[PDB]
Design a protein around this ligand. Structure first.
Ligand code: A1BTH
Ligand code: ZN
Length: 139
């Protein structure tokens, strides 16, 4: 679990979104595993606007933050789950690191702010849904 709170927006993994998220829906994209909902309270997270490929992510299954080198956002095949059939997920970045399903939602941050959130993993890899191209999150 985990979310990004920026301005009047809440960013979560689409496969983990609540009834409240869907009733206050702003935008959702199955191919990216992202959903953004509106909030009443104001968010203070800073979204990074950069091409960084190094950062730090939070891994809930280990109660630790890990430094990672990650790939540029791209289409990556993702195995079928209870939430999606097998498909290409777009805007995904991989890194070598520990992840378990419950780790989705953990933030990845670089020096410039929030990069994205854990969305996939397994086999010693961790995949992150990029949020840096979503320029409208800021205003
Ligand atoms: N974005 C997706 O399609 C994910 C939906 C939930 C399930 N997905 C997934 O990768 N599970 C998983 C398994 C082992 C280690 C880490 C993991 F995140 C895929
Ligand atoms: Zn950066």
């Amino acid at each position: 679990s985990g979310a990004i709170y920026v301005g009047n927006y809440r960013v979560v993994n689409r496969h983990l979104a609540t009834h409240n998220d869907w009733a206050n829906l702003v935008w959702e994209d199955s191919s990216r595993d992202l959903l953004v909902s509106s909030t009443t309270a104001q968010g203070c997270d800073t979204i990074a606007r950069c091409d960084c490929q190094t950062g730090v992510y939070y891994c809930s299954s280990r109660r630790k933050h890990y430094p990672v080198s990650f790939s540029k956002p791209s289409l990556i095949f993702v195995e079928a789950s209870e939430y999606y059939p097998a498909r290409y997920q777009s805007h995904l970045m991989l890194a070598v690191g520990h992840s378990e399903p419950g780790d989705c939602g953990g933030i990845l941050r670089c020096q410039h702010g929030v990069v994205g959130i854990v969305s996939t993993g397994g086999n010693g890899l961790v995949g992150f849904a990029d949020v840096r191209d979503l320029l409208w999150l800021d205003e």
